[PDB]
Write an enzyme that holds these catalytic residues in place. Structure first.
Site, mmCIF file in Angstrom:
data_model
loop_
_atom_site.group_PDB
_atom_site.id
_atom_site.type_symbol
_atom_site.label_atom_id
_atom_site.label_comp_id
_atom_site.label_asym_id
_atom_site.label_seq_id
_atom_site.Cartn_x
_atom_site.Cartn_y
_atom_site.Cartn_z
ATOM 1 N N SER A 27 -1.853 -4.117 0.044
ATOM 2 C CA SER A 27 -1.579 -5.475 -0.425
ATOM 3 C C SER A 27 -0.933 -5.745 -1.776
ATOM 4 C CB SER A 27 -2.881 -6.293 -0.367
ATOM 5 O OG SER A 27 -3.499 -6.197 0.906
ATOM 6 N N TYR A 28 -1.732 -5.205 -2.709
ATOM 7 C CA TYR A 28 -0.813 -4.891 -3.813
ATOM 8 C C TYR A 28 0.298 -3.855 -3.666
ATOM 9 C CZ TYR A 28 -4.523 -7.974 -4.987
ATOM 10 O OH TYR A 28 -5.360 -9.058 -4.866
ATOM 11 N N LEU A 68 1.379 -3.096 -3.143
ATOM 12 C CA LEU A 68 2.218 -1.749 -3.749
ATOM 13 C C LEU A 68 3.409 -1.971 -2.845
ATOM 14 C CD1 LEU A 68 -0.105 1.156 -4.681
ATOM 15 C CD2 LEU A 68 0.845 -0.595 -6.138
#
Ligand SMILES: CC[C@@](O)(C(=O)O)c1cc2n(c(=O)c1CO)Cc1cc3c(CN(C)C)c(O)ccc3nc1-2
Length: 565
Positions: A522-523, A524
DNA sequence: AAAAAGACTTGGAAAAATTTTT
DNA sequence: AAAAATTTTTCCAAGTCTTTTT
């Protein structure tokens, strides 16, 4: 067929789809009442419960091993909800939960779990085939010229709510979702899914401004739950691609924003000073924009804009460092955020003023909420919100750390260790902490014994090469020189094997209290990973599994080894 | 406004299915 | 074969940000 939706002309604003057809949701199988020999007891005497009350009783029985069933809140909420499911004849007998005996019910479910892992190959393969045919018929929807998979088409069965952390509604009953609670969304020209016979849907609508297929309201919080398309779809993936592009646009204007908020610390107005301090916290420490929540409805957790006076402790000097702010609070999912962080002189001084004439329960940032902060961020850059900083800081840290930790001459296992250390730095920044694996952390003993057994094989191989070199001295010929070659390659193969085992042992140790999953998915920006994998010849399957490879299909195809976030 | 609603975004531990050790 | 260590599905919520009501 493989639809490359990323090569298409971007989807217009407003309308989400033109066409939409699905078979609706799969309802959880009906409750099967307990057999004759599984008895319920109240005040030591036998009592047969009505199906509706028996069902709610089974839920508590299945959770009897957990410590949470002894908690005041869990028991209070459960009993209140169980009472509503009882008949009037049952309500007059069952006055309290403590006089109830669920022991036989608990033993039965444990016996069933044991009887299920002792199933035949004929029974096991059959249930797997019944599951697969359910996925072909209900797991796919048709959205604009294409067949796309649905994520969670099976509606979750009824049970008891627990939630995460210290939730005030733990123990409450999550009732069975009926067709009468279901709102279906599809196009006017689509074949409307039929409800189970003898039932009707709550509503059939045709809203092309939304992305969901099915919705209903859940009884715990009173919120609307949805059934949407899977991560590999266009509607999810295009929005994910856009999230990352928004984060790249923040990158080209981040120094301009930093210089302005640094100057805003000195402003005449307090609202502007608080907004600037909160922005610093969201930038430097990647804190979430804490939205205000209703008291007594959810577990007491906070973020940046909802921080209280009691959540920070100010120290002019600590550990030999100047101007330290000791953060101690519960963020999302009740995960503890603890950090001793050195700040600039102007922030520390500003924080002393926001804590002046206030009680511990009062908000640190009075005159400030997430709406005001996001209204300002929207003026600094179009489409910029608070969470975009978390995405930016995570992705840029992954990119810079992969660029600094990856050594050219290293083998694949060593490069994966460099990748994981980089992902670890992202997870620490985002505070994706983890409690050490339930004992099971003693699997480090098992890896160390296998390493020591491999060190034995290598030491035996080195003795073989030693005597092969000694045999090459006495009677020097081209037949004994070739034996030294084969023994050297045997030492080389064993050295690589040991290197792989030692790299895997280090990977697990450094990842003891760290959860990599959330940032990874989700974050990267997946293109940063794809680019790295192609640059060093590390196969993508070593980093991303099957499901992650499907979600990030767009990045794998559309991204060169030279991509820069 | 500013609450209230609605609509998106953001796994990990425990089981179970396999696999490996013994 | 049988116990043990792994790899893979199964279980179950909580935030952020946008859009409507009051
Ligand atoms: C554990 C990490 C995290 O809480 C998080 O915020 O960091 C989370 C939770 C959940 N998911 C995630 O992707 C993520 C990571 O980004 C997906 C998900 C589905 C869940 C479902 C299934 N629904 C969607 C049908 C539940 O029923 C209950 C809790 C659930 N929790 C999660």
């Amino acid at each position: 067929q493989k639809w490359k939706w990323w090569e298409e002309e971007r989807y217009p604003e407003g309308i989400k789809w033109k066409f939409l057809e699905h078979k609706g949701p799969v309802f959880a199988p009906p409750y099967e009442p307990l057999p004759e020999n599984v008895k319920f007891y109240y005040d030591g005497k036998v009592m047969k419960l009505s199906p509706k009350a028996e069902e709610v009783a089974t839920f508590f029985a299945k959770m009897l091993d957990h410590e949470y069933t002894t908690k005041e809140i869990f028991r209070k909420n459960f009993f209140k909800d169980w009472r509503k499911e009882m008949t009037n004849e049952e309500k007059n007998i069952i006055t309290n939960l403590s006089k109830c005996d669920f022991t036989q019910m608990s033993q039965y479910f444990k016996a069933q779990t044991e009887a299920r892992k002792q199933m035949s190959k004929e029974e096991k393969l059959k249930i797997k085939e019944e599951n697969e045919k359910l996925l072909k018929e209900y797991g796919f929807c048709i959205m604009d010229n294409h067949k796309e998979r649905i994520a969670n088409f099976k509606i979750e069965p009824p049970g008891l709510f627990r939630g995460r952390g210290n939730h005030p509604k733990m123990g409450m009953l999550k009732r069975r979702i009926m067709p009468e609670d279901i709102i279906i969304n599809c196009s006017k020209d689509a074949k409307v899914p039929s409800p189970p016979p003898g039932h009707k849907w709550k509503e059939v609508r045709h809203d092309n401004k939304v992305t969901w297929l099915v919705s209903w309201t859940e009884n715990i919080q009173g919120s609307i739950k949805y059934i949407m398309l899977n991560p590999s779809s266009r509607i999810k993936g295009e929005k994910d691609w856009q999230k990352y592009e928004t984060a790249r646009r923040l990158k080209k204007c981040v120094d301009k924003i930093r210089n302005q908020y640094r100057e805003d610390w000195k402003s005449k107005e307090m609202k502007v000073r608080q907004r600037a301090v909160a922005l610093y916290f969201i930038d430097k420490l990647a804190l979430r924009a804490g939205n205000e929540k209703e008291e007594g409805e959810t577990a007491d957790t906070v973020g940046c804009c909802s921080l209280r006076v009691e959540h920070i402790n100010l120290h002019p000097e600590l550990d030999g460092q100047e101007y330290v702010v000791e953060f101690d609070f519960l963020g999302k999912d009740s995960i503890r955020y603890y950090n001793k962080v050195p700040v600039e002189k102007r922030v520390f001084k500003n924080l002393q003023l926001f804590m002046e004439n206030k009680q511990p329960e009062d908000d640190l940032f009075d005159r400030l909420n997430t709406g005001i902060l996001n209204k300002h961020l929207q003026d600094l850059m179009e489409g910029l919100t608070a969470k975009v900083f978390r995405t930016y800081n995570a992705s840029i840290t992954l990119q810079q750390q992969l660029k600094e930790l990856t050594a050219p001459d290293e083998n694949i296992p060593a490069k994966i260790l460099s990748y994981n250390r980089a992902n670890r730095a992202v997870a620490i920044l985002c505070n994706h902490q983890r409690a050490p694996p339930k004992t099971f952390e003693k699997s480090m003993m098992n890896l160390q014994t296998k390493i020591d057994a491999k060190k034995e094989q290598l030491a035996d191989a080195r003795r073989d090469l030693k005597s092969a070199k000694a045999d090459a001295k006495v009677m020097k010929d081209a037949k004994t020189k070739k034996v030294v070659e084969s023994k050297k390659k045997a030492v080389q193969r064993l050295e690589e094997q040991l290197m792989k085992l030692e790299v895997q042992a280090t990977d697990r140790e450094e990842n003891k209290q760290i959860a990599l999953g959330t940032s990874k998915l989700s974050y990267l920006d997946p293109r940063i990973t794809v680019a790295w994998c192609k640059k060093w010849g590390v196969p993508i399957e070593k980093i991303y599994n099957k499901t992650q490879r499907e979600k990030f299909a767009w990045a794998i195809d559309m991204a060169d080894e030279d991509y820069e976030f």
